[PDB]
Design a protein around this ligand. Structure first.
Ligand code: HEM
Length: 180
């Protein structure tokens, strides 16, 4: 199961609405049924003159393990979209492993407003794709997304009823790490 070839960013989106503060994933849809562990995620993306750099956190809800990353790449000219390389870091943002240039993720913004966003992520590890991942984002953990963002979900051809909500998973976040 490859990522979809029919994902594009919403035109007209204000990048300022996306590159703000920290995001928490409130809801996710992973199209590959083979993927079984559920994660919580939070991240803080920043942009300067077309370069994106972001600090990312995952917590595996089933195992109570976590990992940290720093991603970096360039904004596409065509819309709010980037393909990032990523390194592995500790909680103090020291590098553990430099980026493997055979791996990347492509993040496409589908909607963003002051409180909420919807993004699509295609993670690739060499040959292999992870399958489509859709994440509904809010700035406050366990808040509901806006009506505008919920509309974006339907308009992406999805149903919110199918998403996993993270607020009931027993997440632990490292809010020190995502506060820049
Ligand atoms: C709750 C939402 C999310 C879930 C369920 C999820 C799920 C996963 C899973 C299952 C893996 C491991 C893949 C493997 O074992 O190789 C993974 C890794 C990864 N994810 Fe997430 N993810 C989420 C959000 C995101 C976000 C928002 C980003 C980027 C902004 C992202 C970027 C990455 C990266 C960079 C890796 C590392 C791949 C590696 O270690 O080489 N994820 N994610």
């Amino acid at each position: 199961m490859d990522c979809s070839t029919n994902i594009s960013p919403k035109q007209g989106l204000d990048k300022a609405k996306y590159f703000s503060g920290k995001w928490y994933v409130t809801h996710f849809l992973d199209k590959d049924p083979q993927v079984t562990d559920q994660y919580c995620s939070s991240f803080t993306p920043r942009e300067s003159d077309g370069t994106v750099k972001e600090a990312l956190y995952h917590y595996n809800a089933n195992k109570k393990t976590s990992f940290y990353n720093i991603g970096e790449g360039k904004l596409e000219s065509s819309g709010l979209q980037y393909t990032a390389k990523y390194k592995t870091v500790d909680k103090k943002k020291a590098v553990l492993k430099e980026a493997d240039e055979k791996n990347s993720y492509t993040l496409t913004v589908l909607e963003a407003d002051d409180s909420s966003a919807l993004v699509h992520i295609c993670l690739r590890e060499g040959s292999k794709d992870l399958g489509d991942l859709y994440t509904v984002l809010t700035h406050q953990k366990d808040a509901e997304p806006s009506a505008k963002v919920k509309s974006a979900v339907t308009q992406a051809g999805l149903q919110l009823s199918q998403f996993v909500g993270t607020k009931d998973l027993g997440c632990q976040y490292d809010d020190q790490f995502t506060s820049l």
